[PDB]
Scaffold this active site. Structure first.
Site, mmCIF file in Angstrom:
data_model
loop_
_atom_site.group_PDB
_atom_site.id
_atom_site.type_symbol
_atom_site.label_atom_id
_atom_site.label_comp_id
_atom_site.label_asym_id
_atom_site.label_seq_id
_atom_site.Cartn_x
_atom_site.Cartn_y
_atom_site.Cartn_z
ATOM 1 N N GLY A 11 14.618 -78.946 49.641
ATOM 2 C CA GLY A 11 14.944 -80.381 49.665
ATOM 3 C C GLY A 11 14.469 -80.988 50.969
ATOM 4 N N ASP A 60 25.674 -84.947 59.471
ATOM 5 C CA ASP A 60 25.649 -84.819 58.006
ATOM 6 C C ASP A 60 26.744 -83.844 57.544
ATOM 7 O OD1 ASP A 60 24.596 -85.489 55.428
ATOM 8 O OD2 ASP A 60 23.103 -83.835 55.521
ATOM 9 N N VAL A 91 14.204 -72.848 51.815
ATOM 10 C CA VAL A 91 14.958 -71.746 52.402
ATOM 11 C C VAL A 91 14.983 -70.548 51.455
ATOM 12 C CG1 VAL A 91 17.091 -71.027 53.527
ATOM 13 C CG2 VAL A 91 16.379 -73.458 53.659
ATOM 14 N N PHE A 142 15.599 -80.591 53.843
ATOM 15 C CA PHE A 142 15.650 -79.555 54.881
ATOM 16 C C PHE A 142 14.472 -78.552 54.825
ATOM 17 C CE2 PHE A 142 18.214 -78.521 51.164
ATOM 18 C CZ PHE A 142 17.613 -77.341 50.733
HETATM 19 C C1 LY4 Z 1 22.321 -78.331 49.218
HETATM 20 N N1 LY4 Z 1 22.019 -77.166 50.081
HETATM 21 C C2 LY4 Z 1 22.447 -77.438 51.477
HETATM 22 C C3 LY4 Z 1 22.624 -75.908 49.577
HETATM 23 C C4 LY4 Z 1 21.907 -74.664 50.216
HETATM 24 C C5 LY4 Z 1 20.459 -74.985 50.662
HETATM 25 C C6 LY4 Z 1 19.595 -73.769 51.105
HETATM 26 N N2 LY4 Z 1 20.000 -73.396 52.461
HETATM 27 C C7 LY4 Z 1 20.548 -72.210 52.665
HETATM 28 C C8 LY4 Z 1 20.876 -72.084 53.954
HETATM 29 C C9 LY4 Z 1 20.518 -73.271 54.588
HETATM 30 C C10 LY4 Z 1 20.591 -73.733 55.907
HETATM 31 C C11 LY4 Z 1 20.124 -75.003 56.244
HETATM 32 C C12 LY4 Z 1 19.580 -75.824 55.266
HETATM 33 C C13 LY4 Z 1 19.503 -75.353 53.948
HETATM 34 C C14 LY4 Z 1 19.964 -74.077 53.613
HETATM 35 C C15 LY4 Z 1 21.499 -70.929 54.438
HETATM 36 C C16 LY4 Z 1 22.389 -70.126 53.699
HETATM 37 C C17 LY4 Z 1 22.771 -69.126 54.598
HETATM 38 O O1 LY4 Z 1 23.546 -68.203 54.378
HETATM 39 N N3 LY4 Z 1 22.214 -69.286 55.772
HETATM 40 C C18 LY4 Z 1 21.451 -70.348 55.711
HETATM 41 O O2 LY4 Z 1 20.791 -70.730 56.676
HETATM 42 C C19 LY4 Z 1 22.820 -70.304 52.366
HETATM 43 C C20 LY4 Z 1 23.228 -71.500 51.897
HETATM 44 N N4 LY4 Z 1 23.635 -71.396 50.614
HETATM 45 C C21 LY4 Z 1 23.522 -70.118 50.243
HETATM 46 C C22 LY4 Z 1 23.809 -69.459 49.043
HETATM 47 C C23 LY4 Z 1 23.597 -68.093 48.919
HETATM 48 C C24 LY4 Z 1 23.101 -67.375 50.002
HETATM 49 C C25 LY4 Z 1 22.828 -68.027 51.202
HETATM 50 C C26 LY4 Z 1 23.027 -69.399 51.324
HETATM 51 C C27 LY4 Z 1 24.117 -72.590 49.891
HETATM 52 C C28 LY4 Z 1 23.166 -73.108 48.812
HETATM 53 O O3 LY4 Z 1 21.876 -73.602 49.278
#
Ligand code: LY4
Length: 273
Positions: free
Chosen positions: A15, A135, A20, A17
């Site tokens: 998105g 945010d 990832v 960001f």
């Molecule tokens: C809308 N968006 C922010 C949701 C995010 C979006 C994907 N995402 C994962 C994410 C970050 C960090 C900053 C921006 C967006 C990130 C990270 C993690 C994490 O553990 N460390 C991360 O840095 C995760 C976020 N998520 C995880 C789900 C399963 C494993 C790991 C995930 C949440 C879902 O994805």
């Protein structure tokens, strides 16, 4: 190099960001997240003490990543010809708070209290490190489901904390304060408290309180779910129309609703295990 140092797994999301991916640090199998952003999409730039030109996100993350905290920490970063790559902590098992509330509905106030308290401590950490997240919302809060610990993610909309006015905002609108809607101006700490009121409402009601601008500026909070009088009071205080009428972090954490918080471990055992 990044490629031999990290085993790359599936896309976790993409998105504003960037993109990832799940990853594992090859040396010790540490779970990580690997965040890519194209240089052309980076609006806000900063520099390291030694003068390397980096995204502001990297400056902010470095500032908050020292010591242990409720923030996902930056472990390393890499510059590529057309992008930056950030290596972040990844809890396991994990779920974001948006998904958690979607699945489970409105949270029991004991759980909301534990969660909200942890977010408050994390936000205090950022502010003490000189960083404003900008945010704060359910989507940017990860729950470590085994440890009962909450972690803040996505400093891509953040800024260095200052005492003067902010006139830019690229965070989430419905978590944005009436002074932004009306004047395109806000101050960091009182705007943060507004977003925390929205978050607390979201937690105990299962959805955010306002959809349209007119509700945001209107001064009325309607409760769609049963919420205690003390919790309603704290929410309404955080969502004061006048920024100067909002509580400080101290006043929030001293509010009667915030008393007798569960430990992260207890929270997991009672609500998450
Ligand atoms: C809308 N968006 C922010 C949701 C995010 C979006 C994907 N995402 C994962 C994410 C970050 C960090 C900053 C921006 C967006 C990130 C990270 C993690 C994490 O553990 N460390 C991360 O840095 C995760 C976020 N998520 C995880 C789900 C399963 C494993 C790991 C995930 C949440 C879902 O994805």
């Amino acid at each position: 190099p990044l490629e031999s140092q990290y085993q790359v797994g599936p896309l976790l999301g993409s998105g504003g960001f960037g993109s990832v991916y799940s990853g594992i640090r090859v040396s010790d199998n540490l779970p990580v997240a690997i965040k890519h952003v194209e240089k052309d999409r980076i609006s806000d730039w900063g520099e390291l003490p030694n003068g390397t030109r980096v995204p502001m996100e990297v400056v902010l993350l470095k500032k908050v990543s020292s010591g242990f905290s409720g923030v996902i920490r930056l472990l390393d970063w890499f510059e590529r010809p057309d992008s930056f790559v950030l290596i972040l902590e990844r809890p396991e098992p994990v779920q974001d708070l948006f998904d958690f509330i979607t699945e489970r509905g409105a949270l029991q106030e004991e759980l909301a209290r534990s969660f909200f308290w942890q977010v408050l401590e994390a936000v205090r950490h950022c502010h003490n490190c000189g960083v404003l997240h900008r945010d704060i919302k359910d989507e940017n809060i990860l729950i470590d489901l085994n440890r009962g610990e909450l972690k803040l993610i996505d400093f891509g909309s953040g800024a260095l904390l200052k005492d003067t006015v902010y006139t830019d905002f690229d965070g989430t609108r419905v978590y944005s304060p009436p002074e932004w809607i009306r004047y395109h101006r806000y101050h960091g700490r009182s705007a943060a408290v507004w977003s925390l009121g929205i978050l607390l409402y979201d937690m105990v009601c299962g959805d955010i309180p306002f959809e349209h601008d007119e509700e945001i500026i209107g001064g009325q909070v309607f409760f769609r779910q049963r919420v205690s009088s003390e919790c309603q009071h704290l929410i309404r205080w955080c969502l004061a129309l006048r920024p100067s009428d909002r509580p400080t972090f101290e006043e929030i954490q001293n509010h009667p609703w915030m008393q007798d918080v569960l430990l992260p471990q207890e929270t997991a055992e009672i609500h998450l295990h």
